[PDB]
Amino acid sequence: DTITLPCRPAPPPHCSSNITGLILTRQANTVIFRPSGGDWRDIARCQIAGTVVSTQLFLNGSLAEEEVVIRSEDWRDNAKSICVQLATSVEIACTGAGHCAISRAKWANTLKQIASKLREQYGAKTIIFKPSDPEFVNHSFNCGGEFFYCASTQLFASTWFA
Numbered sequence: 001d002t003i004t005l006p007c008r009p010a011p012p013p014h015c016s017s018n019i020t021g022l023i024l025t026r027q028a029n030t031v032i033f034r035p036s037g038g039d040w041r042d043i044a045r046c047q048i049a050g051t052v053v054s055t056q057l058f059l060n061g062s063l064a065e066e067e068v069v070i071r072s073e074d075w076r077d078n079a080k081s082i083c084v085q086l087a088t089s090v091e092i093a094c095t096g097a098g099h100c101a102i103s104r105a106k107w108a109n110t111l112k113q114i115a116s117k118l119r120e121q122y123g124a125k126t127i128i129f130k131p132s133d134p135e136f137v138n139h140s141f142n143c144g145g146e147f148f149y150c151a152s153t154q155l156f157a158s159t160w161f162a
């Protein structure tokens with residue numbers, strides 16, 4: 001019902017943002033994706049972030065018009081990262097007690113929409129999200145000039161069949 005990510009340090013409740021997108025890195029009818037650890041420069045090539053600076057997930061960025069869209073400089077080269085832009089932003093709510101919470105049902109539908117787009121692009125039936133420096137292995141984001149780190153293993157640890 002709710003996914004509760006542990007965070008360090010405790011992000012204030014007004015640091016809660018909107019997940020407008022993320023960045024993946026591709027590793028049969030089974031293709032595996034992981035949250036990218038590339039530098040914030042590699043984040044820039046997605047061109048869908050807003051003002052906040054964040055790893056693994058795009059907070060407070062731009063949304064797609066109708067449906068989820070995925071872009072890549074080259075789908076053949078796996079070193080190139082996949083830029084996922086959400087159509088409906090998923091809300092991440094920090095409570096100030098050391099955890100930022102996300103609704104499980106909405107992230108599941110988001111992962112299913114992403115899987116459907118990744119299925120059309122790679123022709124595979126099964127899309128698997130596997131977990132990921134500490135700044136890039138975690139969902140790290142800058143709120144109010146202060147940096148935070150959240151364990152994102154709960155977000156990227158699922159499977160999605162056809």
Ligand SMILES: *[C@@H]1O[C@H](CO)[C@@H](O)[C@H](O)[C@H]1NC(C)=O
Pocket residue numbers: 014015016017018052059060141142143144
């Ligand atoms: C994202 O935007 C919301 C609403 O504008 C704001 O409350 C929140 O602090 C922003 N997130 C960051 C990390 O600045």
Ligand SMILES: *[C@@H]1O[C@H](CO)[C@@H](O)[C@H](O)[C@H]1NC(C)=O
Pocket residue numbers: 016017018089091
């Ligand atoms: C962005 O987040 C704010 C609160 O943090 C929320 O009111 C707003 O609906 C979110 N944006 C979208 C498009 O849902």
